[PDB]
Design a protein around this nucleic acid. Structure first.
Ligand SMILES: [Mg+2]
Ligand SMILES: [Mg+2]
Ligand SMILES: [Mg+2]
Ligand SMILES: [Mg+2]
Ligand SMILES: [Mg+2]
Ligand SMILES: [Mg+2]
Ligand SMILES: [Mg+2]
Ligand SMILES: [Mg+2]
Ligand SMILES: [Mg+2]
Ligand SMILES: [Mg+2]
Ligand SMILES: [Mg+2]
Ligand SMILES: [Mg+2]
Ligand SMILES: [Mg+2]
Ligand SMILES: [Mg+2]
Ligand SMILES: [Mg+2]
Ligand SMILES: [Mg+2]
Ligand SMILES: [Mg+2]
Ligand SMILES: [Mg+2]
Ligand SMILES: [Mg+2]
Ligand SMILES: [Mg+2]
Ligand SMILES: [Mg+2]
Ligand SMILES: [Mg+2]
Ligand SMILES: [Mg+2]
Ligand SMILES: [Mg+2]
Ligand SMILES: [Mg+2]
Ligand SMILES: [Mg+2]
Ligand SMILES: [Mg+2]
Ligand SMILES: [Mg+2]
Ligand SMILES: [Mg+2]
Ligand SMILES: [Mg+2]
Ligand SMILES: [Mg+2]
Ligand SMILES: [Mg+2]
Ligand SMILES: [Mg+2]
Ligand SMILES: [Mg+2]
Ligand SMILES: [Mg+2]
Ligand SMILES: [Mg+2]
Ligand SMILES: [Mg+2]
Ligand SMILES: [Mg+2]
Ligand SMILES: [Mg+2]
Ligand SMILES: [Mg+2]
Ligand SMILES: [Mg+2]
Ligand SMILES: [Mg+2]
Ligand SMILES: [Mg+2]
Ligand SMILES: [Mg+2]
Ligand SMILES: [Mg+2]
Ligand SMILES: [Mg+2]
Ligand SMILES: [Mg+2]
Ligand SMILES: [Mg+2]
Ligand SMILES: [Mg+2]
Ligand SMILES: [Mg+2]
Ligand SMILES: [Mg+2]
Ligand SMILES: [Mg+2]
Ligand SMILES: [Mg+2]
Ligand SMILES: [Mg+2]
Ligand SMILES: [Mg+2]
Ligand SMILES: [Mg+2]
Ligand SMILES: [Mg+2]
Ligand SMILES: [Mg+2]
Ligand SMILES: [Mg+2]
Ligand SMILES: [Mg+2]
Ligand SMILES: [Mg+2]
Ligand SMILES: [Mg+2]
Ligand SMILES: [Mg+2]
Ligand SMILES: [Mg+2]
Ligand SMILES: [Mg+2]
Ligand SMILES: [Mg+2]
Ligand SMILES: [Mg+2]
Ligand SMILES: [Mg+2]
Ligand SMILES: [Mg+2]
Ligand SMILES: [Mg+2]
Ligand SMILES: [Mg+2]
Ligand SMILES: [Mg+2]
Ligand SMILES: [Mg+2]
Ligand SMILES: [Mg+2]
Ligand SMILES: [Mg+2]
Ligand SMILES: [Mg+2]
Ligand SMILES: [Mg+2]
Ligand SMILES: [Mg+2]
Ligand SMILES: [Mg+2]
Ligand SMILES: [Mg+2]
Ligand SMILES: [Mg+2]
Ligand SMILES: [Mg+2]
Ligand SMILES: [Mg+2]
Ligand SMILES: [Mg+2]
Ligand SMILES: [Mg+2]
Ligand SMILES: [Mg+2]
Ligand SMILES: [Mg+2]
Ligand SMILES: [Mg+2]
Ligand SMILES: [Mg+2]
Ligand SMILES: [Mg+2]
Ligand SMILES: [Mg+2]
Ligand SMILES: [Mg+2]
Ligand SMILES: [Mg+2]
Ligand SMILES: [Mg+2]
Ligand SMILES: [Mg+2]
Ligand SMILES: [Mg+2]
Ligand SMILES: [Mg+2]
Ligand SMILES: [Mg+2]
Ligand SMILES: [Mg+2]
Ligand SMILES: [Mg+2]
Ligand SMILES: [Mg+2]
Ligand SMILES: [Mg+2]
Ligand SMILES: [Mg+2]
Ligand SMILES: [Mg+2]
Ligand SMILES: [Mg+2]
Ligand SMILES: [Mg+2]
Ligand SMILES: [Mg+2]
Ligand SMILES: [Mg+2]
Ligand SMILES: [Mg+2]
Ligand SMILES: [Mg+2]
Ligand SMILES: [Mg+2]
Ligand SMILES: [Mg+2]
Ligand SMILES: [Mg+2]
Ligand SMILES: [Mg+2]
Ligand SMILES: [Mg+2]
Ligand SMILES: [Mg+2]
Ligand SMILES: [Mg+2]
Ligand SMILES: [Mg+2]
Ligand SMILES: [Mg+2]
Ligand SMILES: [Mg+2]
Ligand SMILES: [Mg+2]
Ligand SMILES: [Mg+2]
Ligand SMILES: [Mg+2]
Ligand SMILES: [Mg+2]
Ligand SMILES: [Mg+2]
Ligand SMILES: [Mg+2]
Ligand SMILES: [Mg+2]
Ligand SMILES: [Mg+2]
Ligand SMILES: [Mg+2]
Ligand SMILES: [Mg+2]
Ligand SMILES: [Mg+2]
Ligand SMILES: [Mg+2]
Ligand SMILES: [Mg+2]
Ligand SMILES: [Mg+2]
Ligand SMILES: [Mg+2]
Ligand SMILES: [Mg+2]
Ligand SMILES: [Mg+2]
Ligand SMILES: [Mg+2]
Ligand SMILES: [Mg+2]
Ligand SMILES: [Mg+2]
Ligand SMILES: [Mg+2]
Ligand SMILES: [Mg+2]
Ligand SMILES: [Mg+2]
Ligand SMILES: [Mg+2]
Ligand SMILES: [Mg+2]
Ligand SMILES: [Mg+2]
Ligand SMILES: [Mg+2]
Ligand SMILES: [Mg+2]
Ligand SMILES: [Mg+2]
Ligand SMILES: [Mg+2]
Ligand SMILES: [Mg+2]
Ligand SMILES: [Mg+2]
Ligand SMILES: [Mg+2]
Ligand SMILES: [Mg+2]
Ligand SMILES: [Mg+2]
Ligand SMILES: [Mg+2]
Ligand SMILES: [Mg+2]
Ligand SMILES: [Mg+2]
Ligand SMILES: [Mg+2]
Ligand SMILES: [Mg+2]
Ligand SMILES: [Mg+2]
Ligand SMILES: [Mg+2]
Ligand SMILES: [Mg+2]
Ligand SMILES: [Mg+2]
Ligand SMILES: [Mg+2]
Ligand SMILES: [Mg+2]
Ligand SMILES: [Mg+2]
Ligand SMILES: [Mg+2]
Ligand SMILES: [Mg+2]
Ligand SMILES: [Mg+2]
Ligand SMILES: [Mg+2]
Ligand SMILES: [Mg+2]
Ligand SMILES: [Mg+2]
Ligand SMILES: [Mg+2]
Ligand SMILES: [Mg+2]
Ligand SMILES: [Mg+2]
Ligand SMILES: [Mg+2]
Ligand SMILES: [Mg+2]
Ligand SMILES: [Mg+2]
Ligand SMILES: [Mg+2]
Ligand SMILES: [Mg+2]
Ligand SMILES: [Mg+2]
Ligand SMILES: [Mg+2]
Ligand SMILES: [Mg+2]
Ligand SMILES: [Mg+2]
Ligand SMILES: [Mg+2]
Ligand SMILES: [Mg+2]
Lengths: 125, 138
RNA sequence: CGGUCCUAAGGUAGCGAAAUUCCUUGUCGGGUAAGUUCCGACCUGCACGAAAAGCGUAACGACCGGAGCGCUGUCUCGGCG
RNA sequence: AGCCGCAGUGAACAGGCUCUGGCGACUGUUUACCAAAAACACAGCUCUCUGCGAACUCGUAAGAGGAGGUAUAGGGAGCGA
RNA sequence: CCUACGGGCAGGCGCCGAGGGUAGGGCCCGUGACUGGGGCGAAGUCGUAACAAGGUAGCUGUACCGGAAGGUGCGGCUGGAUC
RNA sequence: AUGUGGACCCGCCCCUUGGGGUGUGUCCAAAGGGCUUUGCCCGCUUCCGGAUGGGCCCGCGUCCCAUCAGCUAGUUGGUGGGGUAAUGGCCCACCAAGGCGACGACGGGUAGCCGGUCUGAGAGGAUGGCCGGCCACAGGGGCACUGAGACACGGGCCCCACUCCUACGGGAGGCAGCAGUUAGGAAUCUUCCGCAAUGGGCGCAAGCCUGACGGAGCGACGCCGCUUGGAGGAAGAAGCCCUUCGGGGUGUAAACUCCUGAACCCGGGACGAAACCCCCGACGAGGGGACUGACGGUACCGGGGUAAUAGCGCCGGCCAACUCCGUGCCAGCAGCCGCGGUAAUACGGAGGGCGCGAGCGUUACCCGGAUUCACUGGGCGUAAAGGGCGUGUAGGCGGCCUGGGGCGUCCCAUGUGAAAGACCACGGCUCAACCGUGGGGGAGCGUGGGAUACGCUCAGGCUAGACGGUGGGAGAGGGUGGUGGAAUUCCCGGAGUAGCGGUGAAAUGCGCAGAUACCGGGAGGAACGCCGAUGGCGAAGGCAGCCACCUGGUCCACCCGUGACGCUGAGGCGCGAAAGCGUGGGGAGCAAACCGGAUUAGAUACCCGGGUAGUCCACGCCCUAAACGAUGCGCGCUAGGUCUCUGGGUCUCCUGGGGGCCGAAGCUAACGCGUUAAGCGCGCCGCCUGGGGAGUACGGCCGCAAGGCUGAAACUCAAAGGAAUUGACGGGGGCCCGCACAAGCGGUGGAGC
């Protein structure tokens, strides 16, 4: 484009679409469970991933993943949203923080406990 | 039509050297010579004689080339490796004595028109002036 | 999608509980505190359907149906002259 | 710029308004005397007959209408901007 | 009423005036029986349109038609085989 | 009353927008209180200056959507008033009809702006939180009062909403002040101390108030400093891991032995404070004296003095760190690519290792990488991208010489660009973080001077661009009106039989009611064979028998005329194949739809027989396309070889304008391009920014309609793609072989075993 054109049109600034809107911009978002089920995944993978349909503060309702092995989430369970998709699970771009509200951490977790909201266990006695 | 004479000359030269020749002409201009006046004194070329082409005054410009190298592509190195227009008619470039270029860390030259005639990246700094930055050569 | 029987050929478009839908106050939605009618839908069209035209249409109508505002002796409920 | 009454088109003679469906495009026509309409007609579309002493209609006929017209014309039919 | 009285104040009317009321419009958001396609998702059903001359060369604008991919007509493109 | 003076009317003077001065007329002032009083001090009054703080006005700068394109009645200017500290249409009358906008008005959306801050090589991008400057608001609105100043947080009136007290007989209140409560939220603190210091107000001064401020309090929220110890210590225990059962690892790690010893205990204990004040000198200067600490007995000093918190993430590749077991596409990990199917360094635990450390991780957001909006610093033949083609508006750009001007541009000088912060050196808290001190700077903009090459501007001249003249050339360029022959079809006549048509083979169909085949006659419509080309013409679409009329573009020779009059071109306007639309015509051939015959599992297709619109003309629409060279237009520059069309010449040839091929250099990811660039360059316009969603939706404009132009988003995928390569495949091609077919003889498939 001639320089003249640039003084006319100008270079348009890209802009960027948020991958986690339900959050409303903040890091986390308190919510409440509605349906708790297991869904067949996508792609070359296979299983029955544990997800949750979550009614949150901002009048929103999105599907959220429940990480680890085994949870304690019923219908009217409270919870907290994290942000970050799964992939294998189309249409679900939010994880659930463990050990918060009605989401207890994975029991018998010994490795990466920062996530999975498991506290440090006792060694010997 | 020629929306830019200066550029035409620079390109007229650029296109000759690329194919290696002794001289290519170019329509006469008071401003055009003062430009070649720099290249001679800077040794970027030989010289030029205000020749004439059918009533029309041109400027036979004479080119220098390195020594005939050997091996694949015996064609010599270029005395004028690169030359491109800076301040075009579609965009004029004006710089002060403090905003002057720096072609190849000295290894090159820059030609600019100022209120004190046709100078050089150096002379401009020496004289302490500034004006339209014509081009660059090396 | 297929099979089979039949026909001169087996109803396309577009409409469709309709001036047509029997079952029927069909079912859902909308209007109402409450709506067998009204409006918007579905299609299961008893028994729409293309010049005895089909589907729409601005304007028009002492035509027919539904609703609201204004106002009232129509009414509550009569009285007086 | 003022005055008067509750009030000045001070009496009389003068539309109630909106939203929304059905039918018919519209002005118009009709059962003189229970139906004025969604019925008739209507511009318009299509089919069809008719070569001119036309076809068609009335008359036994003569005669006439068609028409003192001639296919962009005339008759019949259905539909109906 | 007080005057330092051709005065002031109280009081009276008026303009503008928050806003309230009545009426009719514009824009935007949420929502709605029903409806249209779109995306994704498993080894579902139907055919084989395209990729090789894909077994009718393909594609294309437009038009009509057909359960579906598609078919045909008109003109155009080669981003088309082949001795 | 007094007027030093001030105020206003007029004339006058100077200046010159109501500035100073003059003259004349009229109007205008006051406050006392305390005394080591008879003299000072604290105040009062009008004026002209100073200083400080403002108000108003102006130039430039200040986000997103044109899918907001037209906006405005006090609206724009005027006159004259009202109004204020004063300009102003601020307000009000009247006059005129103006004012604003593609240089984006009006409208919707977002937002307090700057110093700074974050990132970045830079330019930029993002940001405006603490501190500082400005603005605005003080429950929502309106209003005025007081005053030097407010239309006023803790002042007033009114309306509204909300809330509270009440003997309800009626009134009250405004945390976006400091803390605290409540709701909202992923989430953000003490209802603390002190006026000791600093600042502020009042006062002669003591002194007084001060949730400003100085501090303390809570929160790893951040940066910084600090600790859980140090030396020695084994061929290196136990335990736990692997293991080829030989051994390897955790590992100097521990233990253990010495050493110091943060915290704690005791004493001491601040700098932060000095003035105001008091005495002397006059309360001036000076000197001297005295007072007061919140933080708190805290920092720090001495000595005593105990080995004393370690956690988090990762170890498939990017990316540093590997084994066992469990698990078996399950449970699960996951930023991307992907891991898990009975041997998983990728899941889960363990051992071990890598990385950090009072932290380690996660999520979210900004810059970076992204050069991926490309000013610095990119693209559009085939990857996303050249407008379907012209004409032209505004706009951008513009040829050779000379002069005035000196706007842009450039130099110098000067002002401004405060601080804080940042950067540089030196100091202060035991260092650092912080903090002080001192120093370095512009960029910009105002002012003064200067320079004139380049652009600009004015003036003059020129001819190389462009246009015009003169004489000629080729052409399916276009419009109108005519017109010719071949063939198809139909009808009439003759002649003439037994079949014609068609197909892969067929059937439907036509034919003894006399078909096909042949001659003759007539009607009619569309299309123009050979020439014809690998050609020509046009901007594109596109244009073809022949003739005439009307008409565009274009090429050559002559160097005659004009004298930069150019290029490009947002919008605008016009043209725009086919199909399609409307009103009329026209209709031979053909042929969507449709019907019949076939093929097929089906065959709404391909093939055959019929066949309507349409195909043709006129007029008016529609405006699309593989509208293609998938290559915008003009100018300049950079080897040539050969073919062809069309000119001009002294006509082997040279020279101009076109149309193809191969190719120098060069460009290109490659294929390829290459004097007809996709080469080297300048000007201008259009367009591209991952694929799907979709050229869909909404809005808008256009259309009779079909639809066209403009043209998104949610959502979804980890790719979508270009060129080329090796292969494989082909109901592609060439060449070739095999009991592979064919040729010929035996059998198997049936029976019994
Ligand atoms: Mg039949
Ligand atoms: Mg049907
Ligand atoms: Mg259908
Ligand atoms: Mg319907
Ligand atoms: Mg009903
Ligand atoms: Mg109901
Ligand atoms: Mg209801
Ligand atoms: Mg209801
Ligand atoms: Mg009712
Ligand atoms: Mg009824
Ligand atoms: Mg209904
Ligand atoms: Mg029925
Ligand atoms: Mg009917
Ligand atoms: Mg029926
Ligand atoms: Mg019927
Ligand atoms: Mg009928
Ligand atoms: Mg009817
Ligand atoms: Mg109807
Ligand atoms: Mg009527
Ligand atoms: Mg009554
Ligand atoms: Mg009575
Ligand atoms: Mg009145
Ligand atoms: Mg009246
Ligand atoms: Mg009336
Ligand atoms: Mg009346
Ligand atoms: Mg209806
Ligand atoms: Mg009627
Ligand atoms: Mg009707
Ligand atoms: Mg009537
Ligand atoms: Mg009557
Ligand atoms: Mg009657
Ligand atoms: Mg009767
Ligand atoms: Mg009656
Ligand atoms: Mg009537
Ligand atoms: Mg009647
Ligand atoms: Mg008669
Ligand atoms: Mg008779
Ligand atoms: Mg007769
Ligand atoms: Mg007669
Ligand atoms: Mg007659
Ligand atoms: Mg008739
Ligand atoms: Mg009728
Ligand atoms: Mg009002
Ligand atoms: Mg109002
Ligand atoms: Mg409204
Ligand atoms: Mg499937
Ligand atoms: Mg096809
Ligand atoms: Mg196929
Ligand atoms: Mg086949
Ligand atoms: Mg095919
Ligand atoms: Mg093909
Ligand atoms: Mg088509
Ligand atoms: Mg079917
Ligand atoms: Mg297709
Ligand atoms: Mg074709
Ligand atoms: Mg004066
Ligand atoms: Mg006095
Ligand atoms: Mg006293
Ligand atoms: Mg102010
Ligand atoms: Mg005035
Ligand atoms: Mg004031
Ligand atoms: Mg004024
Ligand atoms: Mg006025
Ligand atoms: Mg525009
Ligand atoms: Mg402007
Ligand atoms: Mg704009
Ligand atoms: Mg707004
Ligand atoms: Mg805001
Ligand atoms: Mg800034
Ligand atoms: Mg910074
Ligand atoms: Mg940097
Ligand atoms: Mg910067
Ligand atoms: Mg900003
Ligand atoms: Mg704040
Ligand atoms: Mg602040
Ligand atoms: Mg509040
Ligand atoms: Mg002030
Ligand atoms: Mg206040
Ligand atoms: Mg107030
Ligand atoms: Mg204020
Ligand atoms: Mg307050
Ligand atoms: Mg209070
Ligand atoms: Mg508070
Ligand atoms: Mg608080
Ligand atoms: Mg809460
Ligand atoms: Mg605090
Ligand atoms: Mg204090
Ligand atoms: Mg003080
Ligand atoms: Mg004092
Ligand atoms: Mg107090
Ligand atoms: Mg206090
Ligand atoms: Mg404080
Ligand atoms: Mg701390
Ligand atoms: Mg934390
Ligand atoms: Mg060992
Ligand atoms: Mg060991
Ligand atoms: Mg040790
Ligand atoms: Mg000791
Ligand atoms: Mg002590
Ligand atoms: Mg004191
Ligand atoms: Mg002293
Ligand atoms: Mg002293
Ligand atoms: Mg102590
Ligand atoms: Mg000690
Ligand atoms: Mg120890
Ligand atoms: Mg890590
Ligand atoms: Mg790393
Ligand atoms: Mg590694
Ligand atoms: Mg798997
Ligand atoms: Mg699988
Ligand atoms: Mg993990
Ligand atoms: Mg294993
Ligand atoms: Mg495996
Ligand atoms: Mg991993
Ligand atoms: Mg592991
Ligand atoms: Mg380890
Ligand atoms: Mg390890
Ligand atoms: Mg962190
Ligand atoms: Mg960096
Ligand atoms: Mg650029
Ligand atoms: Mg690019
Ligand atoms: Mg280009
Ligand atoms: Mg493509
Ligand atoms: Mg492309
Ligand atoms: Mg093009
Ligand atoms: Mg164009
Ligand atoms: Mg177009
Ligand atoms: Mg164009
Ligand atoms: Mg122009
Ligand atoms: Mg210009
Ligand atoms: Mg120029
Ligand atoms: Mg000049
Ligand atoms: Mg300066
Ligand atoms: Mg000069
Ligand atoms: Mg001139
Ligand atoms: Mg001529
Ligand atoms: Mg000629
Ligand atoms: Mg010629
Ligand atoms: Mg011709
Ligand atoms: Mg011609
Ligand atoms: Mg012609
Ligand atoms: Mg015959
Ligand atoms: Mg015969
Ligand atoms: Mg045949
Ligand atoms: Mg037959
Ligand atoms: Mg026969
Ligand atoms: Mg016979
Ligand atoms: Mg014949
Ligand atoms: Mg041509
Ligand atoms: Mg073409
Ligand atoms: Mg063509
Ligand atoms: Mg001509
Ligand atoms: Mg001449
Ligand atoms: Mg001349
Ligand atoms: Mg042009
Ligand atoms: Mg036009
Ligand atoms: Mg067209
Ligand atoms: Mg056509
Ligand atoms: Mg037509
Ligand atoms: Mg017709
Ligand atoms: Mg068929
Ligand atoms: Mg069949
Ligand atoms: Mg069968
Ligand atoms: Mg056929
Ligand atoms: Mg046929
Ligand atoms: Mg049609
Ligand atoms: Mg080109
Ligand atoms: Mg010749
Ligand atoms: Mg040529
Ligand atoms: Mg080539
Ligand atoms: Mg090469
Ligand atoms: Mg060539
Ligand atoms: Mg996309
Ligand atoms: Mg897309
Ligand atoms: Mg797309
Ligand atoms: Mg569209
Ligand atoms: Mg389209
Ligand atoms: Mg939209
Ligand atoms: Mg639309
Ligand atoms: Mg387009
Ligand atoms: Mg390829
Ligand atoms: Mg093959
Ligand atoms: Mg072959
Ligand atoms: Mg054999
Ligand atoms: Mg045999
Ligand atoms: Mg057997
Ligand atoms: Mg056997």
């Amino acid at each position: 484009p001639t320089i003249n054109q640039l003084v006319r049109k100008g270079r348009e600034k890209v802009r960027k679409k948020s991958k986690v809107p339900a959050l409303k911009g903040a890091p986390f978002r308190r919510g409440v469970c509605t349906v708790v089920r297991t869904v067949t995944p996508k792609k070359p993978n296979s299983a029955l991933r544990k997800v949750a349909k979550v009614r949150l503060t901002s009048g929103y309702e999105v599907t959220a993943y429940i990480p680890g092995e085994g949870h304690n989430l019923q219908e009217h369970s409270v919870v907290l949203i994290r942000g970050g998709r799964v992939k294998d699970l189309p249409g679900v771009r939010y994880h659930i923080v463990r050990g918060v509200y009605d989401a207890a951490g994975v029991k018998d977790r010994k490795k990466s406990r920062s996530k999975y909201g498991t506290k440090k266990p006792k060694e010997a006695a | 039509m020629l929306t830019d004479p200066i550029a035409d000359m620079l390109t007229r030269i650029r296109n000759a050297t690329r194919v290696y020749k002794e001289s290519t002409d170019v329509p006469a201009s008071r401003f055009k010579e003062e430009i070649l006046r720099i290249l001679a004194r800077e040794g970027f070329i030989k010289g030029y004689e205000r020749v004439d082409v059918d009533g029309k005054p041109y400027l036979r410009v004479y080119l220098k080339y390195g020594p005939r190298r050997q091996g694949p592509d015996p064609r010599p190195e270029q005395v004028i490796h690169h030359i491109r227009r800076i301040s075009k008619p579609g965009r004029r470039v004006y710089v002060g004595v403090k905003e002057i270029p720096r072609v190849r860390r000295g290894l090159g030259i820059a030609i600019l028109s100022t209120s004190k005639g046709v100078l050089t990246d150096r002379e401009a700094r020496k004289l302490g002036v500034g004006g339209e930055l014509i081009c660059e050569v090396w």
